[PDB]
Write a protein that binds this DNA or RNA. Structure first.
Lengths: 101, 123, 128, 94, 60, 28, 662
RNA sequence: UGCGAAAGCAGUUGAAGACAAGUGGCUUGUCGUUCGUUAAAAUGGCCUCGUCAAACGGUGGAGAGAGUCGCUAGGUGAUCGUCAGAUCUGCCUAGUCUCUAUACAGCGUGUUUAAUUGACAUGGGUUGAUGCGUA
């Protein structure tokens, strides 16, 4: 919750981009390596979504250069694949007991 | 004064400064009003830096000015954020950069050794 | 081959709907990417596929949406800069044609849950 | 993952008892709140995996345009026998 | 030969070996002593640059 | 198949340096 | 073919950090700039460049030092009527005085106490303070003549090392020490309190680390001492009463160097937080109240500022500053915040470190005490010579056919046979004790065997023997700056050479008869010389960026209209052309280059018509093509009739002063 | 800009004059100028007033951490091997099992539904970073 509240304070307060400007491979790996863990939880995943979206918006060339965060993006992709299967099947359970009202 | 852009009067009310817009650009004139003790004027391009003429219009727009109770110094606060104390006897400037947005208000103390400033930060 | 025939036809001057049909003929994923990688400019392929996906946002063919998603993956540094007079309302009506599926994915997942419940209790009560 | 297999079987089998119960949502509120907060953010991670997968296969196809080139590109060297012929004190020596 | 090349280099370059109670120093050459100023004292040069790269000023 | 096409066009809607040695040319 | 261009970035020849700037003459605002003014730049690898600020800062001479040599302070000395004298401390126990002619030390005076931390020169320049690591301040009697230095007096000792010195006048000597204090000694001979320390002042210490006073100057118009210490604070102290008037909390880290102008209306200051602060007292109220104000502040440097100095004359008023990033920066003195500034290139190769040979497509390049050779193909490093029997390197040349290399420094030179053994070379010393004993500046290879040697003591040999060389009239600037009549350049191919000395004298020499036939015919310092075998011509270019050519056996009509039909690029050029050659496919077009551009002039065409030393001060006396897209430039040459070799440079922690984030 | 629902649906972006720069005109750009239309950047960031320690009362927790190769479900690797399968007592994940000052987080205890006390002369001076190794 402390990592979440400083992410949310930087999101509401100023700029995700300001907090992410001067980074490179070695100084982004903490963020994405936490975003792997934060993408599972419901309370963090909106903030994890927009932080990952901004960092791939403004570091799409470091994606090409460094291979050792390509694999981090691939692991993040399979994480969002598991989570989207979960968020789809939760909607299916929601419908299947909406049927029982 | 046949065209005025901005104006201020000292704390004792003994003199007043203002801007002119008389051609290539504006101008700045100070005048004592309760006596003909002093009245001077100069184009403010001699106040402004050489960097500001190749920069944005905020660097040369002026949103505040103030004078002290002797008319020795004058504070020009610009819309870029800086303040500049000119020394009116010789037109040498000193830059004070803290305001990261526009300078909206300036004042001197009575002895003239402290400058209150306020802007878009609420500080 | 037939990808080269579609390339030459779509590159000459004309036959854009027939060009997308010839692209849908062989329809490889690798050659689908290669036909985007080869050409240096488009004759408003975005405009004709914009009107095709606007008139059919619910088609069972994955060909033109696959072509649109690979075009947007590989060339969107230039689709936002080729033209911005008719292309602005083009992307506008394409986005408004496609937002309704985002509006109705929850009801389709709900009905999928409904039907899985019904078919599984019907498989359950199978009379010994 | 594992436990909602239990919750879908409880609804399928006991489909009469908890449709005859008078307040379904009031009696199993915690299930409704859990599934609502699980499935409420589904458009957000839809947009997340669209934007993520786009850049992922973008660098994947750009690097698969030249994926064979970095297998024998490294032809680097070191302080070779020019250093031995270089050491002029060791050239007076040996 | 890979693990002792610096050893034989330094043991052939260096001088002033021991002889029992004694130590036989070489005198240097007017060549070097009149072509160059003497080397810096690495103690004080390291002190000055280590001060200007102390941790308390956050360099980057 | 309806959820599959809804998923793919939802994806569509949510989808809407110097080396050490070169060799180049200049004017004669 | 069209011109195919090898943009090489292989050579990582990197200079070292500027540690000491000094000006030869002091300021004297109301008199003209003297013709003898030189700036001296001591780096941190131990070499001392000497630049002349006439017409955008050309570099006259360079005095290199060798392995593990550095230079921390240096001071000039010019008693009126006698030659310039240049003393310098390194990181050692000696002071080193250099004779400016040869580029060698002519004196290594071992100061009789400890490792020297700072050096300063007396006003009237008869005495020299060296402030040492064991807390001593040693006076060295300088006025005995150039070269002879005597010990005078060790001043009253103390514990901590004295890190900076200054003199009040001939009378007092001020010293900032590493215990956070500022002592004041009296060096007034024949007083009762001679040598004992009169006062001690203590600066506001840092809370969590020790404080060191890094820079101390005396301000003669008022009666103060300005002092910068390692907290960043800058303090002004009344000399009589020995006490603080006002303290400014200016920098964020240490203040390494600070200086002032002539009339002490400004004090400029700089340090490791890489901003230059300006403290002004120019108002009549400021002068009658003795109140400096913190006027301005500029961010111009990249890493540090370790040296700052100021010059101010009738047609020159600039402060010069340099630091850990290797470049120099010129600003205006009385117009610091308002005016403009010029960041010099990190190297302007007036003395080259790279040359190529067209056979084998190979290029040699020498940094400090090692040479390296690679070939074009890509490219491949074929050989290198890290000769460590050597200590310092200087200029080098290869034989045409690429057989024998000759490396040469001012103490000796050495010649190495080379044999390409395939993907490597084999290099063998060939002994010649005449070469092993001679001092060499330039070696330029008459034949595959014959070379011409310019010695550091003005000898011109021809080995593998003696060119008669006439003498030059010794005027006041030649006796003042004692290297003006020294052979800078010599260029040769096929038995005909030409030498060049910086008085404006460029003399041809036939290698057969070894007679001069002088063609001096010049007005200032000569930047480069190249001989055109077509037209039978010499091509000189001077520091004013004019191209003259003359014939041999005075200037041609092509020179006569070219000089004043010269292009606007040449008329607004800032970096001097350090290299000329001729094209290989055409024997008459010539292809030249400075440190930030590449040009080519055509032999017959003529085109139609329609922060410097700028005064009326004299010099040291009393189809056209232009490109700059290879601007961090080190050396260019040719290989064959269509390709070009453009070898350049390419890139450290610094005090983070962050740009505004959005 | 208008109508709207938080989605969206319709509309765009002219003219005059002055000035600046570049090459009396021509080009470009501005405006503390007017008329009409519903219509990114000057190295430049936020005060002191007392800290530290130990409790207590509510509020949240993804719990902060350590084991058992103990079970359940998996994902996967090195070498050999035709596979079969061998050794690594293969590794990693999640759940379970076991234990701790609920270890974690936050607000409050001046009066509040509730809940707090105690240390310290809250200075000056000299070293203290070049004195240090357990890596």
């Amino acid at each position: 919750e402390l990592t979440l509240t400083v992410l949310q304070e930087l999101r509401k307060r100023g700029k995700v981009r300001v907090a992410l400007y001067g980074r490179d491979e070695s100084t982004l790996e903490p963020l994405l390596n936490w975003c792997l863990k934060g993408i599972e939880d419901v309370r963090s995943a909106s903030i994890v979504a927009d932080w990952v979206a901004v960092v791939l918006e403004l570091y799409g060339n470091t994606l090409e250069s460094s291979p050792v965060l390509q694999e981090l993006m691939i692991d993040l992709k399979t994480k969002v694949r598991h989570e989207i299967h979960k968020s789809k099947e939760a909607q299916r359970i929601e419908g299947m007991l909406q049927l029982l009202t | 004064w046949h065209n005025v852009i901005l104006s201020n009067i000292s704390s004792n009310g003994k003199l007043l400064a203002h801007m002119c817009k008389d051609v290539e650009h504006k101008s700045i004139s100070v005048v004592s009003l309760f006596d003909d003790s002093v009245n001077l004027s100069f184009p403010l391009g001699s106040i402004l830096s050489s960097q500001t003429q190749s920069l944005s219009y905020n660097t040369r727009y002026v949103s505040s000015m103030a004078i002290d109770n002797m008319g020795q110094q004058l504070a020009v606060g610009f819309a870029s954020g800086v303040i500049s104390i000119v020394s009116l006897a010789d037109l040498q400037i000193r830059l004070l950069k803290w305001h990261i947005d526009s300078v909206l208000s300036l004042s001197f103390s009575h002895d003239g050794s402290y400058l209150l400033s306020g802007g878009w930060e609420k500080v | 081959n037939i990808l080269s025939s579609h390339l030459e036809a779509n590159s000459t001057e004309i036959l854009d709907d027939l060009m997308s049909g010839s692209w849908t003929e062989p329809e490889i994923k690798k050659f689908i990417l290669t036909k985007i990688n080869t050409v240096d400019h488009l004759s408003k392929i975005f405009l004709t596929i914009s009107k095709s996906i606007t008139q059919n946002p619910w088609n069972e063919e994955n060909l033109l949406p696959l072509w649109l998603k690979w075009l947007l993956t590989l060339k969107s540094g230039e689709l936002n800069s080729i033209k911005d007079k008719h292309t602005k309302k083009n992307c506008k009506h394409l986005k408004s044609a496609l937002r309704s599926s985002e509006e109705i994915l929850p009801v389709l997942l709900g009905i999928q849950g409904r039907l899985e419940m019904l078919r599984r209790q019907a498989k359950l009560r199978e009379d010994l | 993952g594992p436990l909602n297999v239990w919750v879908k079987w409880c609804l399928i089998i006991h489909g009469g008892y908890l449709v005859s119960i008078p307040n379904l949502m009031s009696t199993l509120s915690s299930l409704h709140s859990t599934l609502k907060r699980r499935s409420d953010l589904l458009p957000r991670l839809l947009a997340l995996d669209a934007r993520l997968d786009c850049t992922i296969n973008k660098f994947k196809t750009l690097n698969y345009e030249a994926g064979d080139i970095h297998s024998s590109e490294p032809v680097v060297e070191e302080d070779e026998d020019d250093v031995e012929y270089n050491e002029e004190l060791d050239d007076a020596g040996l | 030969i890979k693990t002792k090349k610096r050893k034989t280099l330094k043991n052939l370059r260096k001088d002033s070996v021991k002889r029992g109670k004694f130590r036989v120093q070489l005198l240097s050459t007017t060549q070097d002593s009149k072509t160059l100023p003497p080397k810096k004292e690495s103690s004080i040069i390291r002190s000055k640059d280590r001060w200007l790269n102390r941790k308390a000023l956050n360099k980057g | 198949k309806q959820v599959e096409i809804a998923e793919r066009n939802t994806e569509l809607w949510n989808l809407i340096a110097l080396p050490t040695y070169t060799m180049e040319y200049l004017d004669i | 073919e069209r011109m195919i261009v090898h943009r090489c970035r292989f050579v990582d020849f990197t200079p070292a950090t500027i540690t000491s700037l000094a000006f030869s003459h002091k300021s004297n605002i109301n008199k003209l700039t003297p013709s003898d003014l030189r700036l001296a730049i001591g780096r941190s690898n131990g070499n001392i460049e000497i630049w002349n600020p006439r017409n955008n800062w050309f570099q006259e001479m360079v005095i290199e030092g060798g392995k593990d040599r550095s230079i921390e302070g240096l001071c000039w000395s010019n008693v009126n009527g006698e030659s310039l004298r240049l003393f310098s401390i390194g990181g050692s126990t000696v002071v080193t005085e250099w004779d400016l002619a040869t580029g060698l030390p002519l004196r290594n005076y071992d100061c009789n106490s400890g490792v020297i931390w700072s050096i300063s020169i007396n006003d009237s320049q008869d005495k020299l303070s060296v402030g040492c690591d064991n807390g001593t301040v040693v006076l060295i009697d300088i006025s005995g003549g150039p070269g002879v230095l005597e010990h005078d007096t060790i001043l009253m000792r103390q514990e901590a090392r004295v890190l900076t010195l200054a003199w009040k006048k001939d009378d007092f000597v001020i010293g900032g020490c590493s215990d956070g204090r500022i002592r004041i000694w009296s060096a007034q001979k024949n007083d009762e309190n001679m040598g004992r320390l009169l006062h001690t002042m203590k600066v506001d210490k840092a809370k969590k680390e020790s404080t060191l006073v890094w820079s101390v100057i005396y301000l003669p118009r008022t009666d103060q001492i300005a002092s910068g210490d390692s907290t960043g604070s800058i303090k002004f102290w009344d000399f009589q009463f020995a006490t603080l008037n006002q303290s400014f909390k200016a920098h964020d880290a240490d203040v390494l160097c600070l200086t002032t102008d002539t009339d002490n209306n400004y004090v400029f200051s700089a340090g490791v937080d890489r901003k230059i602060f300006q403290f002004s007292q120019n108002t009549n109220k400021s002068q009658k109240n003795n109140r400096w104000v913190n006027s301005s502040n500029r961010l111009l440097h990249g890493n540090d500022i370790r040296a700052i100095c100021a010059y101010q004359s009738k047609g020159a008023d600039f402060l010069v500053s340099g630091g850990v990033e290797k470049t120099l920066v010129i600003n205006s003195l009385t117009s610091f915040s308002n005016g403009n500034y010029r960041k010099m290139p990190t190297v302007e190769p007036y003395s080259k470190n790279v040359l190529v040979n067209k056979e084998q497509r190979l290029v040699v390049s020498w940094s400090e005490s090692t040479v390296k050779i690679w070939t074009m193909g890509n490219y491949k490093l074929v050989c290198k010579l890290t000769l460590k029997d050597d200590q310092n390197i200087s200029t080098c040349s290869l034989s045409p056919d690429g057989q024998v290399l000759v490396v040469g420094r001012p103490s000796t030179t050495k010649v190495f046979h080379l044999q390409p053994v395939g993907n490597k070379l084999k290099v063998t010393k060939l002994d010649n004790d005449l070469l092993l004993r001679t001092s060499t500046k330039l070696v330029k290879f008459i034949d595959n065997s014959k070379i011409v040697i310019c010695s550091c003591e003005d000898d011109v040999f021809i080995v593998d023997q003696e060119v008669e060389l006439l003498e030059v009239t010794s005027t006041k600037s030649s006796i003042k700056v004692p290297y003006i009549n020294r052979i800078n350049h010599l260029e040769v191919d096929q038995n005909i050479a030409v030498i060049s000395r910086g008085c404006g004298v460029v003399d041809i020499l036939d290698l057969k008869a070894r007679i001069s036939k002088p063609l001096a015919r010049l007005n200032n310092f000569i930047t480069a010389v190249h001989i055109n075998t077509s037209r039978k011509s010499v091509v000189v270019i001077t520091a004013d960026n004019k191209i003259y050519e003359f014939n041999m056996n005075v200037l041609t009509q092509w020179s006569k209209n070219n000089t004043d039909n010269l292009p606007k690029e040449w008329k607004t050029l800032k970096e001097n052309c350090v290299g000329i050659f001729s094209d290989i496919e055409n024997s008459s077009r010539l292809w030249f280059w400075g440190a930030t551009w590449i040009s080519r002039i055509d032999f017959d065409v003529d085109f139609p018509i329609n922060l410097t030393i700028t005064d009326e001060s004299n010099f040291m006396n009393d189809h056209f093509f232009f490109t700059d897209k290879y601007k961090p430039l080190l050396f260019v040459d040719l290989i064959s009739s269509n390709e070009l070799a453009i070898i350049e440079r390419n890139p450290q922690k610094a005090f983070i002063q962050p740009k505004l984030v959005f």
